[PDB]
């Protein structure tokens, strides 16, 4: 038998029961979709900086 197709009634009250969450940002996001050539050079630019701060202090 015919019934109720669709409604958005009560859905915002359900979403605000736990009160819509912001996704909790961090320092250093991931490199997901960051350009691969930049990533390849970033690897070596951080390798050399690890060695530079190693030799600076020892």
């Amino acid at each position: 038998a015919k019934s109720k197709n669709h409604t958005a009634h009560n859905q915002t009250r359900k979403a605000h029961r736990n009160g819509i969450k912001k996704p909790k940002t961090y320092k250093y996001p991931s490199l997901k979709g960051v350009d691969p050539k930049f990533r390849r050079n970033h690897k070596h630019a951080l390798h050399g900086t690890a060695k530079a701060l190693a030799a600076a202090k020892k």
Partner: protein, 159 residues
Amino acid sequence: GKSHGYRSRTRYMFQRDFRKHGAVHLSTYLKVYKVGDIVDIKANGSIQKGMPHKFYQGKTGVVYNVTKSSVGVIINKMVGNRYLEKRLNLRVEHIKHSKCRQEFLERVKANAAKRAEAKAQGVAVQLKRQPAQPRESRIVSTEGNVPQTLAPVPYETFI
């Protein structure tokens, strides 16, 4: 039946804004975008490549990636009861800088400048913004300003 294509309900959104059709002016292609800049999204209807979905019109996000002709943009989208990060691959004619991030950076520079003139002398310079305040005491003169006004007006039809 029903229709939910990629550019459905975009009759007016991707229209090209009276007497501004045709070629895109060149400052659009010479603006420089760094990773971390806050950009606005408004799709040009005349360029069909790199084109954002209609959800992202009027949305404002952060550049995470820079490519040959395009930038990637982080946009927070409200899926159900939480926010999901969306990564967008948009060409730079669908992208413009946010003027809010201009205005806040001159406020940062003004804050540093007045803190320097407070360090020179006169500490506690009170450098936060304030909301609009209730007005102070005035004295209103009646000099060439004698308060003269009539009454409400009678009804006439003037048809």
